[PDB]
């Protein structure tokens, strides 16, 4: 996260770190959506242009974390993956359309003060909240700058941007399964995700029921925190039929 701040303790208890094995490194962010299911970006697991093709045994899920590098004894929980499910129409060839994947854990994680699931939006949540100017919150342990790394989880609040402005900021084809967020150059304020933050949550706190909903998944940006550029997020509600289908079957 660029131009964010340190998370408060227990601020984002659905935050998940995807942690690679051999070699021990940050793979991506992710989020806890139930005691057995973790949501992330498909490109965190499968991205052939970068020779990324992770299988279940390559990765661990670390939940309840605050410090990036420390093993947070008695706080964090470390989970093995049972199965990865990537959207069958995930477009890695082109523009990361439907950048979404699910991971089922081998064992249910116990909830705690530091470990707690986020809600997924229904149609009404999306319709009420996914509006230009409404702010969400992005969290992760990714890079502090485009070109270093944080001691603890970083947080930034960013406004959703009008679809035409999103489209006009890039040469990439922007689909209805994506939205963009971040400040404009004349807005003064700054902030973005960066390398290592993909797969993490873009969340909003419903003012109707005072619950946090994951509206987006951190997907991609052209660099990080560049003037006139925005972050692009997977539209979780638009892909919820797929989410529901996978959880119902498996």
């Amino acid at each position: 996260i660029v131009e964010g701040s340190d998370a408060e303790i227990g601020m984002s208890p659905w935050q998940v770190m995807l942690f690679r094995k051999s070699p021990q490194e940050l793979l991506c962010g992710a989020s806890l959506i139930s005691d057995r299911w973790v949501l992330t970006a498909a490109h965190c697991l499968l991205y052939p242009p970068w020779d990324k093709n992770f299988t279940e045994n390559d990765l661990l899920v670390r939940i309840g974390k605050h410090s990036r590098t420390r093993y947070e004894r008695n706080i964090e929980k470390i989970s093995m993956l049972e199965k990865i499910y990537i959207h069958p129409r995930y477009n890695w060839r082109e523009n990361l359309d439907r950048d979404i994947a699910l991971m089922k854990l081998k064992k249910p994680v116990a909830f705690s003060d530091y470990i707690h699931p986020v809600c997924l939006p229904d149609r009404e949540t999306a319709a009420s909240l996914l509006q230009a100017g409404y702010k969400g919150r992005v969290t992760g342990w990714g890079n502090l700058k485009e070109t270093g790394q944080p001691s603890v989880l970083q947080v930034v609040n960013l406004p959703i941007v009008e679809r035409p402005v999103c489209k006009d900021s890039t040469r990439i084809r922007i689909t209805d399964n994506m939205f963009c967020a971040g400040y404009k150059p004349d807005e003064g304020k700054r902030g973005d995700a960066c390398e290592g933050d993909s797969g993490g949550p873009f969340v909003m706190k419903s003012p109707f029921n005072n619950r946090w909903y994951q509206m987006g998944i951190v997907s991609w940006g052209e660099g990080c925190d560049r003037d006139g550029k925005y972050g692009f997020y997977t539209h979780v509600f638009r892909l919820k039929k797929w989410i529901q289908k996978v959880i119902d079957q498996f």
Partner: peptide, 11 residues
């Protein structure tokens, strides 16, 4: 390694 070692049970 920048990351602190993880208990061997998770590996």
């Amino acid at each position: 390694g920048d990351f602190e070692e993880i208990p061997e049970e998770y590996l």
